[PDB]
Symmetry: D2
């Protein structure tokens, strides 16, 4: 089975990658980073986020596996000491695939750029006040004045969305969550304040009022966009597939990361 391994680049990860490649050499495994079917990420969530975006063109043909050699590693399922057991089970061929929802961002100018997000997509102004009109399913909902907005995937609700006061969403729910970044609320300006959870087929559209330049982020990326007509959020039809070998429930994954471990 075709596979590839990406590494954080530090000593522990590079060496662990070579050992697994040597271990995979003892099975019917072929290293191919062009068309892999198993993508193994050795590092942290940042290394895992990069592996996902490196292969977003074949998310339907790829199952992801995360080994964390770092501090937290929310998307990882493996310690480095358990690596040789992973080589064997992945070679045995039997494991189960679980799928998490993804976010779709479409940006329009005056062409059209689309993006896929595993954690979240956020909007901020390119210096100066950030003002947008929030349109939900072609109905105007509010005018946002603040630092920015964050639209999160389910599995991304434990990341940036959490620090903004958002709720934690189990990834079996196909939804997206929008949170505020320090909105101004007074006699003249009024926002909902609360986070909003949108289901599938619901389209959130941001429309500029004054400045049309915004710094848009997709996970670790941060892009500057000029002459923006509209930013559109939507639950993607594509999903990310994880190869699972034991039971690690999302809520237990939450407990270990934030309560104790």
């Amino acid at each position: 089975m075709k596979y590839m391994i990406t590494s954080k680049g530090d000593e522990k990860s590079d060496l662990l990658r070579l050992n697994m490649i040597a271990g995979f050499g003892e099975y019917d495994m072929e290293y191919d980073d062009v068309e892999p079917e198993i993508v193994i990420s050795i590092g942290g969530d940042g290394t895992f986020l990069s592996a996902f975006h490196q292969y977003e063109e074949r998310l339907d043909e790829i199952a992801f596996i995360g080994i964390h050699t770092g501090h937290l590693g929310f998307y990882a399922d493996w310690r480095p000491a358990e690596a040789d057991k992973l080589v064997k089970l992945l070679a045995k061929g039997e494991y189960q695939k679980v799928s998490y929802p993804l976010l779709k961002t479409t940006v329009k100018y005056g062409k059209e750029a689309t993006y896929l997000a595993l954690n979240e997509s956020t909007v901020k102004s390119s210096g100066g006040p950030f003002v947008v009109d929030v349109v939900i399913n072609d109905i105007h909902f509010e005018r946002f004045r603040g630092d920015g907005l964050c639209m999160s995937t389910p599995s991304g609700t434990t990341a940036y969305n959490k620090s903004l006061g958002g709720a934690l969403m189990h990834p079996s729910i196909e939804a997206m969550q929008l949170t505020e970044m320090a909105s101004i609320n007074n006699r003249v300006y009024r926002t909902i304040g609360s986070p909003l959870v949108f289901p599938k087929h619901h389209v959130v559209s941001l429309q500029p009022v004054n400045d049309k330049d915004f710094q848009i982020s997709v996970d670790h990326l941060s892009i500057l966009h000029r002459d923006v007509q509209e930013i559109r959020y939507e639950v993607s039809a594509k999903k990310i597939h994880f190869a699972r070998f034991r039971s690690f429930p999302f809520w237990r994954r939450v407990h270990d990361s934030f309560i104790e471990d």
Copy 2:
């Protein structure tokens, strides 16, 4: 078609109820408050909450309609001036039914009491510190020390859940949201803090650690329970059905109630 009308009891609502009953007398409508198929609530959300719990035994045979003669009326779809137009359209027979998810609470002693909630169910201690262990799908998640907890339905996320910092959930999502009530967090005590959104088939169980007496609420009700072994939260299989005659999206319903109208 069998129907009944409940009223807040004030002058405006009682008179509006008599006019509609007289108006329904001009159609093939029969007043029956024992086995109605249409339940019309004239008043506020409190009047509507009471109508729901008055007929929770036949939620599969009943469609609800809300007329608000009060201040907000989140569950209402009608102004009192539009009442005679409602009599006609409901008599015409053609309207569409929409269904919102409900919450199930099961309380255990040492028998078993169950409840259905449209807004939320909350737990507090019967005086003294409130301490419970939070068990999600038979896995211990946290020990909560604070004033209480609130488990909300989707349509109830705009109510008590909102004031506790929870997120607003579109009612097409079959979920329940758990929020905290002033948990203590220090070197010794640690909670997740963030609200939690659970899908269907997920069972949240609260287990006492010290005191076993808790004041449990279901919407406007507030009960004292003694010798409690376990409180269990779960998305109900039963749903509440609304009779809709025009389009009033949940997000527009949110906008009018909190932004402006």
Copy 3:
């Protein structure tokens, strides 16, 4: 010098109290719990809160010292192993006194009851909705609809006030902080939301609108008051005096309790 020692009542604290009394027998120390000048609390903040209220009539003649045999002990300055060093230094007579501001609560009926608080005073309704008008210096400020309100002292801002989202206030600032308990905010109801920090000589008055029965708390006490005309908050002119033997800054005291130790 006259002194007394109060104890949590468990084995470790009672024995530690007897050892110090025997140790104080080797100096010019006299045990007097009627008119002490040094009050030593062995236990936790709850034990310390009780010692303060046990002697609130002579707060100008008394310096307090806290030994924590429990979990956190925010008001304590001593481990039980350091106890015999405390007997010696307190006998040596030289230590410095620091003073923290106190809160004054005045409740009026239709007589007048006053209270002193070290942590906070909170108001809730006696079952049913809690509605009060908030009057700051005889000017109406807002109508509060929610679960309750919390007025905190500086040293009490790390307690209940903190869990409600309040700010942490250094006790050299003579102020009181008012925080909300789950206020309802919509088209009809509007509160400030933010915590409010009032200086000395500023009088916060709560005035009932409907129900006149409220459950008022002062630290660990919780009282039911009937026929309430007014609840009044104010920075007390009396202060609590602490006997300090080494430097333990408030911010370092904050760090150990909430960051790590």
Copy 4:
């Protein structure tokens, strides 16, 4: 008495400025924008913030007066229709001066730049993660990982500080308030979360851990600083003086801006 008038630059403000100058020509008033003793700002808080920073070198010789021709105008005391009454009373010479505390920011490189703030000073990274060690009075308190930090003056607590969850502080209290901007908190990263209120003579120092480039803001200004060794916060010894002609308490000023008017 020497005075000057600054204007937002729009039609209503420029014309109002000319009318007052013509009105002041009927008294012993001399227009001098080099060494004025009365500075009148016609516009909004942004226009008022600019007038303050335009004359921060003579804050001890200057009393400020605000006329708001815009939307909110928190620092203003006058409607444009009341302008001719202001010319007369200011000419009559009798009014009372009130003083608000100011914030001092000192930035160090590897020289030393200082700034005075009326609202707040905030720190963010120059792209990339923002990590600083928070040192209070030479004692390390926490390592902050997030978007940034905001240190506010009392009168500035109703501005940016409020949108970040901070408390509202009466300006008779000589203090500064530090709030967080979306800190990350998990098993590895831990911050206090709560806002912190520091008294006079308390020195908050931010110390870089990785990147030494930060975008520092002072009110409406935003500067990029390179090779930063330390950012230092402190309650200034200088204060801003307001000319007051009637009673407008800070809490009533708060009520009008956020509750209703």
